[PDB]
Amino acid sequence: QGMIICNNQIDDDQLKAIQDLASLCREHDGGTPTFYNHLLIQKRPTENNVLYFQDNQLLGFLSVYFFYEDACEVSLIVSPLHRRQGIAKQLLQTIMPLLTAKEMTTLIFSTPTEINDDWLINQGFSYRNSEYHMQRNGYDPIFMPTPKLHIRKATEDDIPALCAIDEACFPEHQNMISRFSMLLNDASYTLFLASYNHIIVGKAHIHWQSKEAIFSDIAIFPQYQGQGWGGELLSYCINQALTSGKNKLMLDVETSNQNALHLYTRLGFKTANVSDYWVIPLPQLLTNWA
Numbered sequence: 001q002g003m004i005i006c007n008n009q010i011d012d013d014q015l016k017a018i019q020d021l022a023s024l025c026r027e028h029d030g031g032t033p034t035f036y037n038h039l040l041i042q043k044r045p046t047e048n049n050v051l052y053f054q055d056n057q058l059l060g061f062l063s064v065y066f067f068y069e070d071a072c073e074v075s076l077i078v079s080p081l082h083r084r085q086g087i088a089k090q091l092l093q094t095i096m097p098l099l100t101a102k103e104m105t106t107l108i109f110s111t112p113t114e115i116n117d118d119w120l121i122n123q124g125f126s127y128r129n130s131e132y133h134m135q136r137n138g139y140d141p142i143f144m145p146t147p148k149l150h151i152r153k154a155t156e157d158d159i160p161a162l163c164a165i166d167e168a169c170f171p172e173h174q175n176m177i178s179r180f181s182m183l184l185n186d187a188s189y190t191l192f193l194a195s196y197n198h199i200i201v202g203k204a205h206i207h208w209q210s211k212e213a214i215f216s217d218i219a220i221f222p223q224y225q226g227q228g229w230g231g232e233l234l235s236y237c238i239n240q241a242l243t244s245g246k247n248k249l250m251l252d253v254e255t256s257n258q259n260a261l262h263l264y265t266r267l268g269f270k271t272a273n274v275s276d277y278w279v280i281p282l283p284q285l286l287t288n289w290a
C-alpha cells in the first residue's frame, strides 16, 4: 500500500516509471526539475535516489547530486494527483541522514518556472539562476548566403587560442590546458575555431552521441561580440550536425534573463524545458517543513 525505495542506481523499469511521472508533471506544471539521467543510471557511491510508491504506482521521486563541496542539487517530483499529502516531506526525510553524513549546509532545488514562486519566497528560498534546455528538432539547414568567417576543426596546436577564448568568456571555469588536451584527443568531441581576416575570434564544441549532437562552450571574444559572428559559428555547427545524421540537436543555456535566448531561437532551437534554481540553508528547510 505504500513503499519507499532508496538505491544508488536507477534500473530500466524504474527509469521508465520516473520518465512517465515527469511527463505527467510536465503536463500540469509547464516544465520539470532538471534530472541528470546519466547520473541516475550510474552506480553511485551512496544511495542518492528515493522512490515513493502507493498501491504499485510511482507517486514521488527524489534524487540528490553532490556537485559542490557543501551543497547539493535536489530534483524532486510528486504526482499532480497526490500533492499536499506530505509525499515530498517523506522523500526529503528519507534522504536527510545522507545529507547530514555529508555535512551539506545548503540545498539547491530545480523547479518548473512560476508555479512555486509565491511559497518559495515566503519560506525563505533564494532565486539563483535559470537553465533553458533547448532542442532543434527540424532537419532543415541554416541558409547562409554571405558567410563572414573561416571555420575549421581545432587541433592540439590550437590549445593556447582555445584557452585564451575560455579565459575571456567563461570566468566560472578555471586547469583548462588538461581539459582541452582531453577534448582534442577524444573522437566524441569536435571543437570548431572561427577566424576573421586570419585572426581567431571564437570557438564552439560539439559532443557526438549515437543519435544526438550536443553544442556547448560557444564563445566569441568580448571585443568581437555583437557582429553576428557567434550566430554564424552556431549556424555552421548546426549544418555540420545535420550532415552527420543526428536526429536531435541539443544545448543548455544558463542565464537569468531570457534575452540570451535570441541567439539560439533565431536558428530554430526551442525551449524543451526551463528550470529555475532556488537555494536554501538546510537547517531552515528542516524547521519550515518540520
Ligand SMILES: CC(=O)SCCNC(=O)CCNC(=O)[C@H](O)C(C)(C)COP(=O)(O)OP(=O)(O)OC[C@H]1O[C@@H](n2cnc3c(N)ncnc32)[C@H](O)[C@@H]1OP(=O)(O)O
Pocket: 025, 029, 032, 033, 076, 077, 078, 079, 082, 083, 084, 085, 086, 087, 088, 089, 090, 109, 110, 111, 112, 116, 119, 288, 289
Ligand atoms: C523545495 C521544493 O520542494 S522545490 C520543488 C521542485 N519540484 C517541483 O516543483 C516539481 C513539481 N511540484 C511537485 O512535484 C510538488 O508540488 C512539490 C514537489 C513542490 C511538493 O510535493 P508535495 O508532496 O505536495 O509537498 P508536501 O505535501 O510534502 O508539502 C511540503 C510543504 O511544501 C509546501 N508546499 C508544497 N506545495 C505547495 C503549494 N502548492 N503551495 C504552497 N506551499 C506548498 C508546504 O510548505 C508544504 O507543507 P504544508 O503542507 O505543511 O504547508
Ligand SMILES: CC(=O)SCCNC(=O)CCNC(=O)[C@H](O)C(C)(C)COP(=O)(O)OP(=O)(O)OC[C@H]1O[C@@H](n2cnc3c(N)ncnc32)[C@H](O)[C@@H]1OP(=O)(O)O
Pocket: 169, 170, 215, 216, 217, 218, 219, 220, 221, 224, 225, 226, 227, 228, 229, 230, 231, 232, 251, 252, 253, 254, 259, 260, 261, 262, 263
Ligand atoms: C550553449 C552554450 O554555449 S551556452 C554558453 C554561451 N557562451 C557564453 O556565455 C560565453 C560568453 N558569450 C559569448 O561568447 C558571446 O556573447 C556569444 C558567443 C554568446 C555570442 O557571440 P556574438 O558574436 O555576440 O553573437 P551575435 O553577434 O550573433 O549576437 C549576440 C546575441 O547573443 C546574445 N548574447 C550577447 N552577449 C551574450 C553573453 N555574454 N552571453 C550569452 N548570450 C549573449 C544576445 O541576445 C545577442 O542577441 P541580440 O542581437 O538580440 O543582442
